[PDB]
Structure formats: C-alpha cells, structure tokens
Write an enzyme that holds these catalytic residues in place. Structure first.
Site, PDB file in Angstrom:
ATOM      1  CB  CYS A  86      -0.939  -0.128   1.142  1.00  0.00           C
ATOM      2  SG  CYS A  86      -0.201  -0.505   2.950  1.00  0.00           S
ATOM      3  CG  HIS A 146       0.004   1.924   7.723  1.00  0.00           C
ATOM      4  ND1 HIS A 146      -1.019   1.181   8.041  1.00  0.00           N
ATOM      5  CD2 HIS A 146       0.361   1.913   6.432  1.00  0.00           C
ATOM      6  CE1 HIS A 146      -1.181   0.318   7.136  1.00  0.00           C
ATOM      7  NE2 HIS A 146      -0.385   0.888   5.968  1.00  0.00           N
TER       8      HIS A 146
END
Ligand SMILES: NC(=O)c1ccc[n+]([C@@H]2O[C@H](COP(=O)([O-])OP(=O)(O)OC[C@H]3O[C@@H](n4cnc5c(N)ncnc54)[C@H](O)[C@@H]3O)[C@@H](O)[C@H]2O)c1
Ligand SMILES: NC(=O)c1ccc[n+]([C@@H]2O[C@H](COP(=O)([O-])OP(=O)(O)OC[C@H]3O[C@@H](n4cnc5c(N)ncnc54)[C@H](O)[C@@H]3O)[C@@H](O)[C@H]2O)c1
Ligand SMILES: NC(=O)c1ccc[n+]([C@@H]2O[C@H](COP(=O)([O-])OP(=O)(O)OC[C@H]3O[C@@H](n4cnc5c(N)ncnc54)[C@H](O)[C@@H]3O)[C@@H](O)[C@H]2O)c1
Ligand SMILES: NC(=O)c1ccc[n+]([C@@H]2O[C@H](COP(=O)([O-])OP(=O)(O)OC[C@H]3O[C@@H](n4cnc5c(N)ncnc54)[C@H](O)[C@@H]3O)[C@@H](O)[C@H]2O)c1
Lengths: 332, 332, 332, 332
Positions: free
Chosen positions: A149, A176
């Site tokens: 990601c 994150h």
C-alpha cells in the site's frame, strides 16, 4: 479473466468486492482454511470499515454465490493442493501474507493456475505499481508482486516530483492505520517486539521497506529514498509524509500545479489532488493509490519540501490488484 | 517562590501536581471561572491519564487544601481582576490558552503578581526552553513564554545535533496526541477546520510553529527548520520526527553516542536516551522534555537522517514550567 | 509458598507483579513457549496499561531475575513436559487459557507441581471467589479455579444483596474491556463470529457464564442469575450492571448502607464502595474485585433495582489469584 | 413542506441529508451562529461518520446550494431574531440542544415559523415516536418533540412486548456512542462531572430519562420503566438492553416470532429484526429506530428476559425527524 483468491482477509475480501464492482475480472474460486463456506457468507456480507455488501451473498450447493456468480471454495493450508485449474482460476491473488517469495507463491502453479499476483512486496518477484511501471510487465512473468500500500502511495507522487524537479534524496514517514498483524493488548510478537504492544493504546514505530522499494519501480531513485512508519490507533486510512531535496528549485505553488496536472491526465484515478481541509476519514473507501494534500505540506525553501499524500491502504490497494490483473490480461 | 495558576486545566493541574510532588515551588492560588471549589477537588483528585492523586485534596473553609496546604481560589474571567497579591502569589502560570500575548498576559501584573509564565508560545513574549536558552532569562523580563511541548522536545535534540554536526536545514513532523482544543464528533472549529473533525476517528493534519520556534531559542537555526503536525487518536504522549541534513558527516552510531552522552551530562532530566523497543505508552508520565529513540530513526547517508524523539506533552511540559520558575527565582 | 506461572500473558505477568508485593508467595518458575527469556524481560518491564515495573528486572545466567530473585524459565508447549518439581514450584498458576479442565490442568502434576490454580472458569474444577466461598477450599484439592473476572465482581455484591434482602432472580450485563482473544481488524474467530470483528471499532455482544457461575459459589442463587456481555473499545477496566428482583423491600439508601458496611467490614479490600463521580479509568490498577458505584445505579421500586459495580479485570483478578494461593498455603 | 434547521450539527446536518432524500420536505433555511456559509459547505460535504455527501453543495450569492436548491443562511444566537417567515420556513427543526422547552422553542414562532420540532426530549412539549403514538398528533400542536434516540429505540420494542405479553416492570441500560456534549480530555462539564472525563479513554455512566419517557408515548407503561446509560468510546451507534418481567409467559422463541412479525408489517422501517452475528458497525447509517438482536438477548425464565436492540443514534433519529415532519405535513 477468471480469478482465484488465496486468503480471504482484508485484501482478499476487498479484491473480491472490487472485482464485482467492476468486471473485466471474474472471481471463480476462494481458498481459506480458516474460513469455511457459511462463515465466508458472513465475513463478506458485513464489514466494519467498508459497510455491508450491496448485493446478495449466500451459500448454495457448497458454493459461495455473490450476485448469482457461483464461486468454488477450498480449505487448504498448502497452495500446491488447491485445484485452481479444475475450478477455472487462471490468475491467483495471493493475499495470505505468508507466501510472498517466488518459491512459495509458485506453489499455485502446481494447482493449475497460470499466473500469481502477490498482494505484498516480495523478496524476489518483480514488483509493479499501476501508473508508474506497470507497462514493464510482460507475458513471460508468471509470478508478480503489486508492492505494498505504502509503495503504491509514494511511487506515483515520487514519479511526478522527480520527473519535474529531480529528487536528490528523500526520507519518508508513513502514519499508518492498525492492521491484522497487530494485537489488541500487549502480547507476543516474535521478533517484532513493538508490534505486539496494544494497538489501540499506542503510537508504534515500525520499519518499512516501502520507500526503498520505490527505487525498484522507479530505477532512477534506486538508493535515494528510505523511511519508516508509525502505526496509530485508526482502523483504516494512512498517510505518507515525504521529505525531499530537489535538484531544480520548485515554489510550492509550482509543485501543486504539476501534481494537479498529473492527477487530471496520465495518473487520473491513481494519483488524486486536493486543496480541501481533509482528514483521514475523508478517504474512507477512496479508490486512489495516492491523494496529494496541498494544504498539509510545507516548504522550507525552493529545494527542501515536505509533501503529504493520503491512501486508503485496504481499498485503494485492492482496486490496484484488480487493475494490475486487467492489465496483465490485456497482454496475454 | 509562591505561585498562582490561571486555568486549572490539563497543564494547570499537572503543574500543580508537579509542584506538590517536588516541593520546588509553592502553589498558593488558582483562578478558573469554569471550575468551582468542590469541582476543583474532583478534577485534581481523579485524572484519566495520570492516575489518582497520591496525596490528599479537600475543600475546607473556601480553600482548596492539598497535602494540608491551603490554596486561595478565584473565579474571575478577566485576569485584571484576580487579586494575586492578596494571596501572596509572586509568579503566575498563565495556562488558560487565551491570554498568550504580553498585553493580555500582563493583566496579571495589575492584581499584584510580579512575573508571568505563559504555558504556550507567545507572539511577542520572550521564549525559553530549559536546557537550551534558559540562561538567557534575566530579571528585566516580567512576562515570558515556556514555548510549546513540541518545541521543548525538538529544541534539546536539535541543540545536540547542531552543536556536534551542524544542521544545514531540517523539516519536522510531530505525531501528537489529542488535546482539549479538539472535538469528540465533527463540530465547529472556527478558523481551524480540520481540528473540528472527530478526534478519535481521524488522523488530522495541523499547522505548527514549533519547529520554526527552535530558531528563537537557538538563533543559529533561525530560518533553517520548519514542520507540521498530525493529531492522532491517543490521549497523551507525542513524538517528533526530524528529517535533517547535516554539515559534517555523522554515522548513525556517532549520532547515538553524542545523544547518549548529552542525556547523561549537561541535559540530564531534559533529554533522555533509549535503545529499548518502546511505544508511546512507555512515556506515560515521563518527566523528560525529549527522549531520543535510537532504534526508531533511520539514516539515508552520513548527511541525511531522520531522528525520532518522544515526549509526554502534558507531564514533561508541566515539569518544565516548574523548572523554569525555579530558574527565574534563582536570578531575583 | 513457591509458585510457577504457566502462560506469561496479561494475567501471568500481573500475577507475577502482585506476587512480588506479597512474599507469602514467591514466583520461582515461568513457562511460555512464545516468550523467550530476553523477551520476558521486555514484556515484564513495560506495560501499556499498568506502567513500567517499579522494581528491577534482568536476564542473568539463563534465568529471569525480578527484585533480585532468580526465576527458572521454561519453553514447553505441553504442560506435562514442564519440570516444575525441579524448579521448586509447589503451586502452578494456569493462565494460558487453554488448559481449563481438570484433565488438562492436571498435566502440571506430572512435572511435580502439588496444586494448580486455573485463572479462569473450569467445566469441572472447584471454583472459589475470595470473600464468598474460599473457606470451602480444603487441602485435599489439587486443582482449583479462581473463576472469572466478572464472577469475582458479581459474586461479592450478590452475596451482600442476597444476605440482606434476598435475590429472587437477576439478569446481569457486563460492559467489558477488550481482551487478547479479540482482533484488531475484522478477521477469523472460529465459532465466535462476533469476536472476530474489529475490537476498537465495535460494541460486541458476547455470551458469558459468569452470572450463572455465581450459583456455584453461592449455592442459594443456583438457577437464579444469568447474563451476557458487551465488549467495548477500552483496554482495561469493566463494569457489571445487575438488574435484580428482591424478596424483601429495599430503598436504594438501605442498599447503599448495607454495601458500605460490607466494604468496611468483612469484605474490605474485596468489595469497595464509592459515591464519587467515577469513570472507568478511576479503577486503573485498582485491586478490588468489585466496587459498588452508588451514584450510577437506579431503582424502579423497592423490589426492582439496577446495581453497578466496577472491576479492573486484569489487576483485581490477578491480586485475587495471589490472595487465593495465600489462603491455600495457610491450610497446608 | 418548507423547513428550517436551527443548529446545523450532527442532527441538523443529517436531517438536512435525509430531507434531500424525501421530496415531501424541502430545506429552505438554516441558522447556526457558529458556522458561517462557506464553513457550512465544508461541514455538510465531509462527514467522518456517514461519508461524503452524495450530491452537490456550494455557496452561491450568499446562499447555501444543496442539489441545486438555494437555502438562506442565518447567523443568530437568539431564535426570536431569525426571519423564518421571510425565508419561507414553515416548520423549524430545533436541533441546537439548548431550546428544548415550550417557552424556549416557541421563540421560532415569533420569527414566523408555524411549527417547531424539537430534536430532543422536552420537559413540556408533547412527545412523539414514529410507529408508537405519532397518530396522536393534531394541527393544534405547534411545538412538538421527537423524543430522544434512546426512546425511539426502546419504545417500538416495548410496544410489541407489552402488546403481546405485558410488561409488569423493566429496567434499561443503553451502551451509547460518544456525542458532542463530551470532552476529548478531562475538562470542565459543570453540572455533569462524569461527562467531562476524557471520552475516548472511559466508560462513563450517565443518567437518562429515555426509559421513563416511554410512559409518555405508551401510557400503559407509565411508571413501569426506568434506566441509565454508559457512554463508551465509539463515534456512533448505540444499543439498548431491556431487562423486563412479563405478565404472560413467553418462551424466547415466541418473543422472536412476535418481534419478527412486527418488523415485517406494521412497524416495518421503524423496528428491524436480525438473527445474524452483528456488531455495532453493522448499523452504521442504518435508518431503523430499533433493530432487535435475537442472538444477543437471553432469558432467565418465561417471565424474566433481557432483550437487545441496536440504533444508529445519529442516522435513525435524523430520519425519524423527517418522517414526523412528513406526517405533520400530511394533516395540514
Ligand atoms: N491491510 C492492508 O492495509 C494491506 C495493504 C496492502 C497489502 N497488504 C498485504 O496483503 C496480505 C494480506 O493482508 P490482510 O490485511 O488482508 O491480512 P488478513 O490477516 O486480513 O488476511 C489474511 C488471510 O489469509 C488467510 N490465511 C492464512 N493462512 C492461509 C493459508 N495457508 N491459505 C489460505 N489462506 C490463509 C487468513 O485466514 C486470512 O483470512 C499481506 O501480505 C499484507 O501485507 C495488506
Ligand atoms: N495539553 C498539552 O499537551 C499542552 C502542552 C504544552 C502547552 N499547552 C498549552 O497550555 C495551555 C492550556 O492547555 P490545556 O491543555 O491545559 O487546556 P485545557 O482546556 O485543559 O485547560 C484550560 C483551562 O483554562 C480555563 N479557562 C478558560 N478561560 C479562562 C479564564 N478566562 N480564566 C481562567 N481560566 C480559564 C478552563 O476552564 C480550563 O480549565 C494552552 O495554551 C495550551 O496550548 C498544552
Ligand atoms: N485479561 C483478563 O481480563 C482476564 C481476567 C480474568 C481471567 N482471565 C483468564 O486468564 C487466562 C489468560 O488470559 P490473558 O488475558 O492473560 O491472555 P493472554 O493471551 O495475554 O496470555 C496467554 C499467555 O499464554 C501463553 N501460552 C499460549 N499457549 C501456551 C502453552 N501451551 N504454554 C504456556 N503458555 C502458553 C501465551 O504466549 C500468552 O503469553 C485466560 O483463561 C483468561 O480467560 C483473563
Ligand atoms: N447526536 C445524537 O446522537 C442525537 C440523537 C438524538 C437527538 N439528539 C439531540 O439533538 C440536539 C443536537 O445534538 P447534536 O448531537 O447534533 O449536537 P451538536 O453539538 O453537533 O449540534 C448543535 C449545533 O447547534 C449549534 N448552536 C449552538 N448554539 C446555537 C444557537 N444559539 N443557535 C443556533 N445554533 C446553535 C452548534 O453550533 C452546533 O452546530 C440535542 O438536543 C441532542 O440531545 C442528538
């Protein structure tokens, strides 16, 4: 192209939703030895982060039936034992997180799959990011990686900035969302001590190879980036913070213009652009790989700047897996 | 020195706790129009983040009584009306968040205080950070600022790095706990739109002058640092991420050694040092201004490095306010 | 008495802390195949919920040394292979969560343990709650259960209410902190579907036998209580809400008096009593089994009332494990 | 009917959304002194909990334009000063939280509104719950209350239970999401000390009249129900847990049958029914008042049972405000 999913987790389930939402891709089989058929109905139908599935999901005659498409369900721990060829699965999405090397992921080929797309960075499989290097894919590659990601957020931005001004060097932080690898309360985490500390109580530093990996999909940036991560108590949506030195001078307004232009042309749907006063929830189920936050970043001077980009780590990436498969299907 | 506290909030209460714990200054008065005397007992006694007060606190004869010491209580909205002198308060801690200019904070001088310490950056009051420029304080200065929590984290670290290797330029991100200015659910936030969004739901970018402010306390760094913040869903404890370019080359191990040596000598109790696999909760109620996290940081090369340092934004800062007052008193 | 701990998790670790405040109990051995000796130093020293350990802890000569006491460390998956006897462990705390029957917990007797205290309800081991039925323990019992956290909260309150007024029937809800059994994000949970859902995102209903179990420790209440749970996004500290029908009428002020009296007398340190405006964090590291919240409850009438009691599910329980062993040792 | 909204907060904005789905209701004016026109565009466009507005919103010529419709924006603190009549607003939704009495809400009639719908319980304004007593409304009532979110959950269920089995007595707990009245960190909450404690850190007990208020809407239950609340760290979605004694015996399966029948006919869209293994997030943006959770509840015996029902406190309620206005408009 008919697709199998190995590991029906956050990624596997949301890839499955992305395939149905779109549809030059057809899901025809799912393997997960930890989720039986009736349990898969439930796990797919209800999603805390992305809401209830819009459509029908039911178990019928031993198959998982989604919007009337019957899907063959396997329960195998060892990928070499899954009968992908019998079920018609041509490409397999390897989304377990435990088969990420060429050797391990190649087990799917023993079950009759033709190609494997690893939903994570791989030590040796070639890595692709849509919009950055996906045209480098070719027909001879049977095992590929769609990167992480975080690489999928950073690389499209780094591409635009490097193309226009040149990145001399850069250092990245990603803030994150928590993931399945974390723990609810302080517990054991093998060799990654920090990762075992209670997820919703802590800001947790973590290492990540995502910035160094940009140097693989953008070979001119080999050796010129690295970084690290902080995991924080949100359930989804992440943000990159890239601090870079530029070769050519760029006023922040010139950075904004070049990024905005990239969002509207070559990288449309991959790299977004905003000037609005956004926060992480505003990217909930957002399909971009990277969305540049013009307001949030800051320049020290014309050569030294901090650039901010958001990414829905679960949903953007799952859409990119589908897009990579469509692209590979077009080169058969 | 006898001290008055204006605004009995997170900082005013922890500054009071710090004072009582160490005996370094004597709290003799508190003003807060929004917290009556019996409510002050409750707010002081119970603390979600820092635990129940370990001592006694009661209301007696109109006084807040802590460990048997009586404190005069005021309930004035306008600081010009608070009768400090009657209570014998010499220094005032201005911890409301609404009186941060010299003009506004100077109101405390009308009721008989001698000096005022603003628990926040000030647009115009002289700024001090313990261990960095506090020796520049002198008796002519009746109104001073103890900077922000973020500044007190970054400045000691930047001092050591600059003194040994030279910071050419740097950019800071702070990942910062929720504070009282934020909102539980999406609501109005005046000028700062992003700060109104639901606090425990979101990663929220924010502007901050804290990095720029290092230049006020380390004048060689004026024009050489800036940064921004992300607010995240934790109730306390924050972290600085400083990306900087160095003049003289420095291997990461040399950086470690130099910081460790600082923490053991002249910045002991201000700048800490760890190699442990820590997370934010490990700094719960830590009195340091800044604790360098050796394992979390990363170098790209000998001149370009990302350095990570933790700070208990409530408790380290409150202890520094007390420390600054002790220093000021020694100069009278 | 010399004690071993099987499962060095939230309860294992906290039982070990509590034992170091006693020295009617000495911890001499720990087994956990998932936490190696040097990892144990870390896990023991740092605690996100209950803070850093305030004694000393280090690894020396292959042992864990806490406050100067050397502790033998085992790494066995099968408890029948643990050499307790060699290490001198007379009692073993079984705090893994996976050996809760007499058959499974009796494996410790093979390696030379004399008695086993299961830190959970057991299908067949005799269950004890301190202050309620611990005097029914005798020194012929080799395997015993200390019940659940929830039963330790409910039973002392139910004892007082039943003794004075008579419980005709009751239904209990517990609003409970997240535990290690839950998941950070929606993932698989075997047969307990709801428990797989993201823990920090959700209120999660759950079944619990804790109210029914009160009938085992207070036999007059057998068949008269049952209940259920909601798991919510807090890391520790839980609350019982008992709705009961009383035989004899009780005004709510008579309930308060009787509970207060019990807390000052025979159940002191077990059952607490407050009228303060408390919230869950005011019970952080509180050693009581149950603290009645006088303000929080509500009566409909003199025979139908909702009573509220708080419990630190990790810390209060772990202290009871120690207190039970101390009682057991006094009977040897 | 043309409608104005006083207080463009969680409820005001979601009522506005729900009105833009109705077609029998047109929003023509909004007043909020703390949100200017351009800020209202932002606050309406982005929503952390319910996602981005699925339509268009912009400021044009001094008006807020939603889906092409121009809305007059006021900025008045005193509701008697709002020119509702001039802007065409016939009904006003009173969604500020501070004008809940007949006398205070009645101020809107002075500015030319014809009817007022208070989005909260009122001490004196008649109270309506859709599906329960809304047919008792008549054109003589110029000021009405749509009750609370909690009463809208409990009252439909209580109607079905009482109608079939008779409720002798019951006691309710609601486990409730955070709301705007709470605080991000421990801070002043004058009257309601527990409500000032950090919201994301704590389970917070709270008083509520919502169960007592069911006796206004169902007069046979007057004096037969009361309860309390716990506020817990989720941003939206709540649950009622009703413990009741029944007059006629009812096996849990017969309770299930009767609730399911009610959900399918006369209370369809108000009272839902599920047997699935649901958690709170499964009701995110669910428009029902009350959804019975068949799996979650539990019976002690045929006369004493605990019933569980979910409610999106923001979204179901907001829809009920609109449904009540549509009903009122139908009688004009
Ligand atoms: N969550 C994200 O944000 C994200 C983003 C990009 C990539 N990734 C990557 O995708 C992968 C999956 O992550 P996830 O978050 O979906 O994790 P997850 O834990 O939600 O899902 C993993 C799934 O694999 C299944 N599984 C485990 N062993 C298996 C086996 N032998 N065979 C088949 N299935 C098996 C599990 O039962 C589970 O359902 C990991 O490589 C991860 O790093 C995750
Ligand atoms: N919380 C932190 O991490 C932190 C760290 C460093 C500095 N600061 C700064 O210190 C200040 C206080 O922050 P805080 O977090 O304690 O806020 P807070 O909201 O907890 O406390 C502020 C207090 O001021 C009181 N008050 C408001 N108006 C007043 C008036 N007219 N007179 C007297 N009292 C008044 C309030 O009732 C409240 O108790 C702010 O300037 C803040 O930026 C905060
Ligand atoms: N946490 C609470 O609030 C609480 C309260 C009361 C009782 N309990 C009970 O106590 C027990 C432990 O709960 P916990 O929260 O501490 O769980 P936990 O997951 O933190 O700890 C379990 C520990 O057991 C270890 N383990 C697993 N398999 C093992 C084996 N074969 N041998 C030795 N160790 C092994 C794990 O590595 C871990 O450290 C459970 O029965 C639980 O129901 C928990
Ligand atoms: N949030 C819920 O779950 C919920 C459910 C049912 C009912 N309610 C009730 O609805 C009302 C509003 O609740 P909310 O959660 O939307 O609160 P909120 O704080 O989000 O919104 C209130 C709004 O009123 C505005 N305001 C304040 N003073 C005002 C004035 N004098 N004039 C006009 N506007 C003014 C505020 O600026 C804010 O935008 C309260 O009575 C609450 O109890 C809330």
């Amino acid at each position: 192209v008919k697709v199998g999913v190995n590991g029906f987790g956050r990624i596997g389930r949301l890839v499955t939703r992305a395939a149905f939402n779109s549809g030059k891709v057809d899901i025809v089989a799912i393997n997960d030895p930890f989720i039986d058929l009736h349990y898969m109905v439930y796990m797919f139908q209800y999603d805390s982060t992305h809401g209830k599935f819009n459509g029908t999901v039911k178990a019928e005659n031993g198959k998982l039936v989604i919007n009337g498409k019957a899907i063959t369900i396997f329960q195998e721990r060892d990928p070499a034992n899954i009968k992908w060829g019998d079920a018609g699965a041509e490409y397999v999405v390897e989304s377990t997180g435990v088969f990420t090397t060429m050797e391990k992921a190649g087990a799917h080929l023993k079950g009759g799959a033709k190609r494997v797309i690893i939903s994570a960075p791989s030590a040796d499989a070639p890595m692709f990011v849509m919009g950055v290097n996906h045209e480098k894919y070719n027909n001879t590659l049977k095992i590929v990686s769609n990167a992480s990601c975080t690489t999928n957020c950073l690389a499209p931005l780094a591409k635009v900035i490097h193309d226009h001004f040149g990145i001399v060097e850069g250092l990245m932080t990603t803030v994150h969302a928590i993931t399945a690898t974390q723990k609810t309360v302080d517990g054991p985490s093998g060799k990654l001590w920090r990762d075992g500390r209670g997820a919703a109580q802590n800001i947790i530093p973590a290492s990540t190879g995502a910035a160094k990996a940009v140097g693989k999909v953008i070979p001119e940036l080999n050796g010129k980036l690295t970084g690290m991560a902080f995991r924080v108590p949100t359930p989804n949506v992440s943000v990159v913070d890239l601090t870079c030195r530029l070769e050519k001078p760029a006023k922040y307004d010139e950075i904004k213009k070049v990024v905005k232009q990239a969002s509207e042309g070559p990288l449309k749907g991959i790299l977004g652009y905003t000037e609005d006063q956004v926060v992480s929830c505003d990217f909930n189920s957002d399909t971009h790989s990277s969305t540049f936050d013009a307001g949030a970043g800051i320049a020290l001077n014309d050569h030294f700047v901090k650039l901010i980009s958001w990414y829905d780590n679960e949903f953007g990436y799952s859409n990119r897996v589908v897009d990579l498969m469509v692209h590979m299907a077009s080169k058969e």
